[PDB]
Amino acid sequence: MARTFKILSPTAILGYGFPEESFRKAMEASPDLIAVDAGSSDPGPHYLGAGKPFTDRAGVKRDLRYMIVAGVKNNIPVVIGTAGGSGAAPHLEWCRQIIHEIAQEEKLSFSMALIPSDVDKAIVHQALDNGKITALDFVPELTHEAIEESTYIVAQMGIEPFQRALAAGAQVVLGGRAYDPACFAALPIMQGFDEGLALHCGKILECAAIAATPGSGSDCAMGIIDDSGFTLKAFNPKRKFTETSAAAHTLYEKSDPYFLPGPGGVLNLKGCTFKAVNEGEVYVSGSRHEATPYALKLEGARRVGFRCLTIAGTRDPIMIAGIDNILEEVQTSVARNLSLNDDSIRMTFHLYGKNGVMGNHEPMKTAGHELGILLDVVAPTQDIANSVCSLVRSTLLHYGYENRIATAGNLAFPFSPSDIQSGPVYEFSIYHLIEASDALRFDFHIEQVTPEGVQA
Amino acid sequence: MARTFKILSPTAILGYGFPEESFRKAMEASPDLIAVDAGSSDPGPHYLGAGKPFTDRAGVKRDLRYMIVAGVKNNIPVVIGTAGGSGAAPHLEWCRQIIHEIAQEEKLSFSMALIPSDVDKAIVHQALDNGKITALDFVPELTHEAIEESTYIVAQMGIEPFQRALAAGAQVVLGGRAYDPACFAALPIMQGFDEGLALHCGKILECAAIAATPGSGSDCAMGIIDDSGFTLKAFNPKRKFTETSAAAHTLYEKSDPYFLPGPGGVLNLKGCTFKAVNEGEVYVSGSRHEATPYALKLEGARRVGFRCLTIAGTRDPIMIAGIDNILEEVQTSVARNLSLNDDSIRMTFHLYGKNGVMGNHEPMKTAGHELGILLDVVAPTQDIANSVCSLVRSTLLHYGYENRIATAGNLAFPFSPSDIQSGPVYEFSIYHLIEASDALRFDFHIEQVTPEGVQA
Amino acid sequence: MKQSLCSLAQVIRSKNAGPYELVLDILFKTREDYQRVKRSEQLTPQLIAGLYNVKPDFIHRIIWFDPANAVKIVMPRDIISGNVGDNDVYGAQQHAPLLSIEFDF
Amino acid sequence: MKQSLCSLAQVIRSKNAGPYELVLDILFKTREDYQRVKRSEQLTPQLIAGLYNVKPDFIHRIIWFDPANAVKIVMPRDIISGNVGDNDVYGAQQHAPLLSIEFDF
Numbered sequence A, B: 001m002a003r004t005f006k007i008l009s010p011t012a013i014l015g016y017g018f019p020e021e022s023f024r025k026a027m028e029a030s031p032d033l034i035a036v037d038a039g040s041s042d043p044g045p046h047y048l049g050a051g052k053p054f055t056d057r058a059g060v061k062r063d064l065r066y067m068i069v070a071g072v073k074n075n076i077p078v079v080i081g082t083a084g085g086s087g088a089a090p091h092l093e094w095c096r097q098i099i100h101e102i103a104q105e106e107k108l109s110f111s112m113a114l115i116p117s118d119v120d121k122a123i124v125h126q127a128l129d130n131g132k133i134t135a136l137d138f139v140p141e142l143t144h145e146a147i148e149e150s151t152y153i154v155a156q157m158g159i160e161p162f163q164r165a166l167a168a169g170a171q172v173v174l175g176g177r178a179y180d181p182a183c184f185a186a187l188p189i190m191q192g193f194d195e196g197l198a199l200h201c202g203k204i205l206e207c208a209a210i211a212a213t214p215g216s217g218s219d220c221a222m223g224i225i226d227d228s229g230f231t232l233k234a235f236n237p238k239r240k241f242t243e244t245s246a247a248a249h250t251l252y253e254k255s256d257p258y259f260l261p262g263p264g265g266v267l268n269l270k271g272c273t274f275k276a277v278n279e280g281e282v283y284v285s286g287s288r289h290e291a292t293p294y295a296l297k298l299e300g301a302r303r304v305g306f307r308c309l310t311i312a313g314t315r316d317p318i319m320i321a322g323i324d325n326i327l328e329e330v331q332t333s334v335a336r337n338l339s340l341n342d343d344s345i346r347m348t349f350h351l352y353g354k355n356g357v358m359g360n361h362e363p364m365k366t367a368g369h370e371l372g373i374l375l376d377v378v379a380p381t382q383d384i385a386n387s388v389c390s391l392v393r394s395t396l397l398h399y400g401y402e403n404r405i406a407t408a409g410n411l412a413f414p415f416s417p418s419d420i421q422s423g424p425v426y427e428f429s430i431y432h433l434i435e436a437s438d439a440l441r442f443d444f445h446i447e448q449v450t451p452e453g454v455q456a
Numbered sequence C, D: 001m002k003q004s005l006c007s008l009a010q011v012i013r014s015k016n017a018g019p020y021e022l023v024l025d026i027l028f029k030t031r032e033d034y035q036r037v038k039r040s041e042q043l044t045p046q047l048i049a050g051l052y053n054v055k056p057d058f059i060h061r062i063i064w065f066d067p068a069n070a071v072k073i074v075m076p077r078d079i080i081s082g083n084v085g086d087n088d089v090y091g092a093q094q095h096a097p098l099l100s101i102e103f104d105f
């Protein structure tokens, strides 16, 4: 019937790593829960759409080895949200296999719950027709065509599926796509700790030491929930929590810091306080949670084309000064030479050193002494992308721009080959709320992991 | 010989393209030969090493369609050197297949000679032991291990293999790796035009309108050889040949403009003059050739690892000012997290906007307002490269550098996914002369190309 | 003399808020500084829009978050994260125009 | 009287001469100007070496090609074309230090 609940978040995204000494010091604090976020939409739609991880298998395995060994040894649950980077079926399976390998190598046995977040297209089609879909801010209205042309569709689960898995005795809970705070908050809430404090603590812990200062995406943090607030601490003498660092992480990646919405309710933070306590720790209080009619956020992406790219520098001041017109003239030349006639062939330039990061919103209008010219072509087939990219590359290389004096070639390529096929390109196609229903219930199942695998 | 010999060079490298109108105008001048270079070592060792073209199949096919239709229609030979970009067996076959398709689509029948340039490793090993190999300037001495670990090995042929194929009636001559001037000079020399003038003409024409001004890698040029010199012209009113443009092309890509070595001799240009004639044309005279003991240049490459890369910009002035130290700290962090202890992992950064093009030779020591950060890792396996690249990317993304104020992330990625697996990396391993021998003779084979394929 | 935003702020940054929105966060060094800026009424949509080369109506919200002495500027992403043509998939390096801000107080 | 190279040169450029060598070509608009530069003896290995951050002995040759009113500077590539770590595989954008040259006539 303990009056505190201690949560260890080892790293901002499972796979990003952390210092072994930080993790060891955190375990000396005897957490009640080891929890981590394993995924995000911020790396863009490729990862969900193609079924691929944005994290590295060796890094995820390295990080999980510490976590699972520690949780099993000390009888501390380990809870993971958005398995495998994006939390669809292939991502969940990818992370599951890593865990089996750890159990074989470390000679461990433990129960593991798997909670898939995949949503069949038929459910989404039916919900659209029944008026149960709502676009988030600035998102286009959903159509049947967008649903059908998406690949994996996932819903961000809340606390309740994790709670059911934990109540069934799972020692490791491997969740598919999940609302990042829920990973952290599910267990303390079911043990009676305050929902507002637990979800706000989870929102500050979901990126581990990004909420500390100096920040790190690869260092540990702990939150300790008590009856009146929660305390945040790091485990690296070079890092600490401050009122600013903790409050900044309350704003992080949110549209409105007063109201953080998620499945089942909204965190209302107008009463929050941040107080520096002890040495390098912060006590947070006043967070409130308000229930709302239950809805889930769906994510999906669709393939839009295929990309080929090239990168090269220029050091010539005449070429740099005239670069915008040069690129237009090269494009015109290539279209004429290859008789291009498809507006779906899209050539994009990034001029690093002038406006590569901000594009038309860049305030500085002049380059310095060097540009990095990144070109990419997205086209309906890989062959077309490759062909247009190649001709842009060779045309730009030898283009006779006005007043040119460096007449043997215009580009410094760092690599052989100069052109790189990068493959299918995805765009987000679903970013919409769906009203909860029986059909959308998240089921878990528990498997008994052993050093020999899972039996039968 | 008598009066003149007109050579049309349509483009700097077969596949780079050219304006249809320029080609039409050039044909109205009634060339005696359509010749083109199809390859180069300048794009680096990947293309020979991996057996791949640096040019685009669709571009090559487009350019050859104009050339072969015109040559066959008007009974003008078409001669191509360094087929397929690098001129080894796979490159030659790739270009051969393109030509078969053109004959099928345009309903053409013609004889085509193929001249391979591949050299068996056994020949090179034997030559090394027999003292018949000479390194070119600054090239390391050749070893048996370097020979054995090379992939495709090719020799640059001279004029004589082309001449034997033409004498046998070939209407299209598709040469493997070749000395660039030779595919232009072979025919006029066999017709009695002076060897020195014809080879110098070929050297000036080998990149078509790169030798004109404003230059283009994608526009036509003609040389008209007479018994006292040669005249150079373009076929685009916006381009001209001038004394400077033609003389510049005599210097182009050579280490001594007075003496240009190739298979069978050296062009001596001590006595040459360049003189403007007509309107936008140049007359070149005085070139001469000195025979030398016959030797061939060999090229080869070897695989050195696998690459994974990422590109992202930064717009923050504190990050930019501190970037060199930040990158070192990120490397140290990744090596500790992944327990890296292979000196065969190589991490390279290019900081576009500071010193991406010139490296340690860049005179400017300060960046401007933006950097393009290109990272590449080369390692013994793709998996290792991918893992290191991924961890460097995520560590750099969230690295808490001193005085940071932009604390939600450090990098602007243009793409999803952020990491690009570029695959095998090659380096040059052979760049050496070999004494000619019977085993190194370049033999032609003629096939009859028809609208339904090759007919015997 | 004017007071630069950099002299008053500990954090000046951008990030996505999902794929469709860009948020700019400014956390002030002291509550007094935050209140001075808020009272001045100088951190306006017109100011931000001019700095970013957008129309003032493109700024969706400016949120004064008193518990953190922080202000959040919210605008739509004019390129959805990861769309063809994007410059900054994570929205992480769009803060630089704010570094030019100076207050007349 | 200081006179810039850029005011005299029609061409100032770099390129590979094979994978192991970098060549810099300077071609003058007039024979008069070429000869003035040549006879001045001011375009030395030491000048070029300083501009490129190399030792003077790294410059292999400076060749005065009278028929083209051109001078060619030859040096080894300190990174073989296409080797891991390269910056410019074709050797095409290494000319910029020459743009600072001023003669004294």
Ligand SMILES: Nc1ncnc2c1ncn2[C@@H]1O[C@H](COP(=O)(O)OP(=O)(O)NP(=O)(O)O)[C@@H](O)[C@H]1O
Residues within 6 Å of the ligand: A037, A039, A040, A041, A042, A082, A156, A178, A179, A180, A181, A206, A207, A253, A254, A261, A262, A263, A264, A295, A296, A297, A433, C018
């Ligand atoms: N049920 C819901 N109702 C409303 N909005 C929701 C709901 N579920 C998710 N969202 C929205 O989606 C966001 C999900 O945030 P989070 O779970 O932190 O995502 P993430 O992509 O995994 N982030 P991170 O890994 O930190 O980069 C919330 O901030 C809301 O804007």
Ligand SMILES: Nc1ncnc2c1ncn2[C@@H]1O[C@H](COP(=O)(O)OP(=O)(O)NP(=O)(O)O)[C@@H](O)[C@H]1O
Residues within 6 Å of the ligand: B037, B039, B040, B041, B042, B082, B156, B178, B179, B180, B181, B206, B207, B253, B254, B261, B262, B263, B264, B295, B296, B297, B433, D018
């Ligand atoms: N037999 C030979 N003896 C000496 N040097 C040779 C010989 N053959 C080739 N070379 C050298 O190799 C170079 C080949 O030049 P070239 O044929 O123009 O090559 P390339 O790589 O096809 N050029 P490009 O297509 O214009 O980029 C010559 O300049 C010489 O330096």
Ligand SMILES: C[C@](O)(CC(=O)O)C(=O)O
Residues within 6 Å of the ligand: A012, A013, A040, A042, A043, A206, A207, A217, A253, B408, B409, C090
């Ligand atoms: C992908 C991620 O690293 C996740 C996070 O917010 O921690 C990012 O969005 O920057």
Ligand SMILES: C[C@](O)(CC(=O)O)C(=O)O
Residues within 6 Å of the ligand: A408, A409, B012, B013, B040, B042, B043, B206, B207, B210, B217, B253, D090
């Ligand atoms: C590959 C190429 O385009 C060939 C040429 O010299 O024309 C180059 O070396 O720049």
Ligand SMILES: O=C(O)CC[C@H](O)C(=O)O
Residues within 6 Å of the ligand: A361, C022, C052, C054, C075, C076, C077, C078, C079, C080, C086, C087, C088, C089, C091, C094
């Ligand atoms: O809308 C804006 O002002 C900028 C968002 C932009 O789309 C981005 O690529 O980050």
Ligand SMILES: O=C(O)CC[C@H](O)C(=O)O
Residues within 6 Å of the ligand: B361, D022, D052, D054, D075, D076, D077, D078, D079, D080, D086, D087, D088, D089, D091, D094
């Ligand atoms: O050797 C030099 O001075 C510079 C050559 C450099 O290696 C390159 O990458 O072009």
Ligand SMILES: [Cl-]
Residues within 6 Å of the ligand: C036, C039
């Ligand atoms: Cl005031």
Ligand SMILES: [Mg+2]
Residues within 6 Å of the ligand: A037, A038, A039, A040, A041, A082, A180
């Ligand atoms: Mg997440």
Ligand SMILES: [Mg+2]
Residues within 6 Å of the ligand: A040, A042, A253
């Ligand atoms: Mg994020």
Ligand SMILES: [Mg+2]
Residues within 6 Å of the ligand: A180, A206, A253
């Ligand atoms: Mg999150």
Ligand SMILES: [Mg+2]
Residues within 6 Å of the ligand: B037, B038, B039, B040, B041, B082, B180
């Ligand atoms: Mg060539």
Ligand SMILES: [Mg+2]
Residues within 6 Å of the ligand: B040, B042, B253
């Ligand atoms: Mg070349």
Ligand SMILES: [Mg+2]
Residues within 6 Å of the ligand: B180, B206, B253
């Ligand atoms: Mg050549």
